[PDB]
Ligand SMILES: *[C@@H]1O[C@H](CO)[C@@H](O[C@@H]2O[C@H](CO)[C@@H](O)[C@H](O)[C@H]2NC(C)=O)[C@H](O)[C@H]1NC(C)=O
Ligand SMILES: *[C@@H]1O[C@H](CO)[C@@H](O[C@@H]2O[C@H](CO)[C@@H](O)[C@H](O)[C@H]2NC(C)=O)[C@H](O)[C@H]1NC(C)=O
Ligand SMILES: *[C@@H]1O[C@H](CO)[C@@H](O)[C@H](O)[C@H]1NC(C)=O
Ligand SMILES: *[C@@H]1O[C@H](CO)[C@@H](O)[C@H](O)[C@H]1NC(C)=O
Ligand SMILES: *[C@@H]1O[C@H](CO)[C@@H](O)[C@H](O)[C@H]1NC(C)=O
Ligand SMILES: *[C@@H]1O[C@H](CO)[C@@H](O)[C@H](O)[C@H]1NC(C)=O
Ligand SMILES: *[C@@H]1O[C@H](CO)[C@@H](O)[C@H](O)[C@H]1NC(C)=O
Ligand SMILES: *[C@@H]1O[C@H](CO)[C@@H](O)[C@H](O)[C@H]1NC(C)=O
């Protein structure tokens with residue numbers, strides 16, 4: 001089942017500053033009281049990240065190029081964002097990856113799905129309209145659920161050697177509109193063996209029915225670039241500060 | 253000391269002659285308690301395989317793997333392993349295994365190798381040059397040949413460009429071999445991309461069916477899920493042991509740690525990028541790997557004109573790990589420690605000196 | 614920065630030791646920097662070549678370390694001879710030498 | 713071919729740096745002697761013979 | 763300017779950084795030597811006319 | 812601990828012996844340097860218990876009896892302000908004995924002038 005949403009209000013996408021966010025652990029290695037220089041796909045400091053809104057009438061669910069990695073920031077309350085759409089052509093011709101978090105668990109599937117042009121979920125105050133068919137499945141994985149704006153959700157998605165790395169961090173914030181300025185290293189959550197080509201992605205939202213109403217949420221998309229970071233490890237082994245080696249001569 | 257100095261007369265002094273090295277007592281192997289056996293029966297003993305243009309890939313992970321049943325079998329004609337020793341397949345641990353099963357003919361089995369050419373290598377199945385894994389090929393004349401011809405096995409014969417490694421092409425588009433747009437209809441200079449093998453039991457071994465399973469092991473900076481059936485021994489700590497933690501081989505004195513690893517953090521590294529702590533695969537316990545008490549063996553002697561008595565200094569070695577006296581420099585054997593203070597005759601270090609009067613320190 | 618000279622000597626010695634440690638992580642053209650991985654992954658005819666590459670790389674690193682340690686030892690010996698001269702002439706007597 | 717050229721040029725560069733370090737040590741010793749002469753012969757009268 | 767040469771040179775580790783550090787030490791040592799020899803006074807004295 | 816690596820290393824001869832001999836020469840050279848710098852007196856002098864030096868105060872440079880290290884306050888400040896086959900050999904003279912040598916030199920130059928450096 002698919003439904004065209006024709007009550008949207010036209011608005012250009014926003015942009016904002018990344019500050020010092022998007023840092024994640026490059027590996028599964030504990031380090032104590034040491035500075036480690038690493039070369040990997042990292043998010044540049046103070047970069048221009050694309051800002052999308054969900055407010056009422058804004059409902060931002062486009063398809064964006066994946067590039068070499070995706071940093072997803074979510075200023076979320078009441079759990080509007082439920083999952084993601086990963087693929088190349090987003091149809092039954094190729095094989096696509098589905099990440100969903102419903103009311104019980106998280107489901108990760110690599111199958112040939114027929115995606116709708118406008119995919120969404122719905123809460124009645126009972127509506128699933130994200131696909132119409134699923135033909136050839138190769139990988140299924142059912143796990144425990146990961147989940148004023150009250151919650152901040154950071155995610156890093158990487159496609160390296162046929163391995164899909166999902167890094168995540170939950171942060172309690174109380175800032176009304178923009179991203180807070182601070183440091184929070186993202187722990188690795190799950191590595192999925194997929195071995196598939198992914199070049200495009202799309203966020204999945206949920207409708208509110210009482211037509212339709214969009215719940216208040218905001219999210220940010222940043223792009224990962226190959227660079228060097230100098231990470232500081234404390235006595236307890238958490239990354240407390242980082243240096244971007246290609247940002248400015250002082251950090252160089 | 254005479255052997256080291258290449259002289260028969262040793263002058264009074266201290267001479268570094270050898271290198272003490274604590275040797276490991278026993279071997280400890282700790283693996284996760286996974287007992288479900290890896291599905292190699294579905295890979296190798298399937299009723300029907302697939303054609304080489306549509307070669308079948310199977311993901312093996314999260315199971316204990318037994319490679320002894322593959323090696324001892326007397327049907328596998330080709331067991332060519334690249335990057336790994338075929339006998340040492342049982343020893344190592346990996347994270348993910350990719351099983352590519354297909355059926356080819358005999359003369360083109362040699363094309364399934366890194367760096368060769370041919371129709372299978374160019375248009376059907378290409379192996380990367382950095383391939384780490386094995387190729388297992390066996391004759392299947394009884395199962396894949398029929399009297400009158402078995403034409404259900406096809407190979408891609410025509411393609412515009414050569415394939416990428418680990419890429420498949422199941423498309424059926426009519427290959428134009430001339431300059432005529434013929435609209436996807438077979439005829440003059442328009443050929444079907446797929447051509448049948450046509451296997452018969454009377455055909456020669458160059459044109460006989462061979463089933464090929466290509467096992468690809470990938471080993472990243474990830475926790476290993478595919479391991480051998482090596483048994484996990486009991487945890488013996490505070491002793492110099494050879495150890496194998498989830499494929500992480502080494503030698504050390506494993507003790508109890510106070511480090512707080514995060515749940516994803518398996519092992520640990522120090523400031524000098526050496527592995528100094530691991531998580532126990534079974535009980536999820538952090539164990540510090542201190543290494544072995546290596547030391548310099550120095551011989552303290554007066555002149556051979558005076559006496560033949562010697563003392564041995566093990567530098568930086570505690571006396572419980574080797575007239576025995578403990579110094580900050582190390583363990584000194586053969587010198588009687590006295591409470592009196594004299595001038596330094598033979599320097600030992602850390603305020604310790606030796607002299608002859610017997611040898612005193 | 615009053616005691617910069619001693620801190621510089623300590624930092625140079627620690628940095629040289631750390632560099633000598635970090636030279637073990639370089640394969641010097643071999644497939645891996647770990648001897649156990651080479652001995653478990655390859656047959657002795659090719660493991661001999663890979664171990665030989667690691668041996669010549671580590672030997673070159675050790676020779677470089679010993680050479681720079683000898684140069685620093687000569688510099689420290691010159692400084693210590695100067696310090697002994699100052700101990701003899703400024704502390705144990707009154708010196709007429711200007712500055 | 714580049715491996716052979718790299719090891720040859722690296723050996724040459726290490727030899728050059730070693731020679732530069734030895735000459736720099738010699739020049740540093742000479743400069744310390746010159747500073748001693750500047751302090752003791754120019755800024756004062758020296759009783760040291762020759 | 764050959765990138766393949768630098769990619770092969772990275773297998774040998776931090777030899778180039780060591781050589782640059784040694785040459786930088788020599789270069790600052792020359793300035794230290796000149797500073798020690800000639801700058802022994804902080805007052806610029808002038809002769810009478 | 813690889814025996815095959817050592818068997819291949821034996822083809823290169825006595826390089827390891829030369830490196831060990833050079834490091835041993837450096838190690839004994841450090842002790843010789845400390846011996847030449849600090850051990851210039853064979854008599855361990857002490858200051859008198861009464862510090863009557865005509866108004867001159869040496870408390871900041873004399874050893875503090877209250878401290879277990881027997882160091883001067885200046886020496887204590889100096890010690891506070893300084894922060895795989897590898898072994899570190901301890902120095903022949905410990906920090907306590909070097910402090911004792913400096914204390915003996917200070918007592919000699921305070922109580923006896925320059926006479927102790929030239930004789931009794
Ligand atoms: C929602 O809108 C999209 C875009 O207008 C529709 O997608 C098109 O559907 C028509 C139906 O015949 C196709 O001919 C077009 O090729 C489609 N567009 C693309 C780009 O493929 C979609 O069908 C609409 N959904 C519903 C339920 O009507
Ligand atoms: C020499 O100097 C020391 C330190 O400057 C003097 O010690 C001080 O004595 C007064 C009382 O006489 C105390 O209130 C201070 O706290 C002391 N200072 C320290 C750092 O302990 C000492 O009196 C001076 N004279 C003699 C003869 O020793
Ligand atoms: C981000 O990009 C938009 C349009 O691309 C631009 O208007 C804006 O000034 C940029 N912001 C920064 C901080 O570069
Ligand atoms: C969530 O999805 C799983 C996967 O199909 C399903 O078993 C479960 O019933 C779903 N829960 C709800 C509340 O819809
Ligand atoms: C994929 O699905 C289509 C639609 O049912 C089917 O015709 C095709 O055989 C499937 N391919 C594979 C490899 O399963
Ligand atoms: C992945 O998909 C994109 C777009 O379809 C394509 O340009 C690219 O070549 C593909 N990469 C691989 C390795 O198949
Ligand atoms: C490290 O953890 C301890 C508790 O184990 C805590 O008291 C301390 O503040 C922590 N330090 C940092 C820098 O997080
Ligand atoms: C396939 O079946 C034969 C029949 O005895 C057996 O010997 C062999 O071990 C089986 N191979 C696998 C991989 O299970």
Ligand SMILES: *[C@@H]1O[C@H](CO)[C@@H](O)[C@H](O)[C@H]1NC(C)=O
Nearest residue numbers: 283284285286533534535536
């Ligand atoms: C088996 O391993 C799991 C972790 O993978 C652990 O929780 C459990 O206690 C282990 N059981 C035994 C009997 O060692």
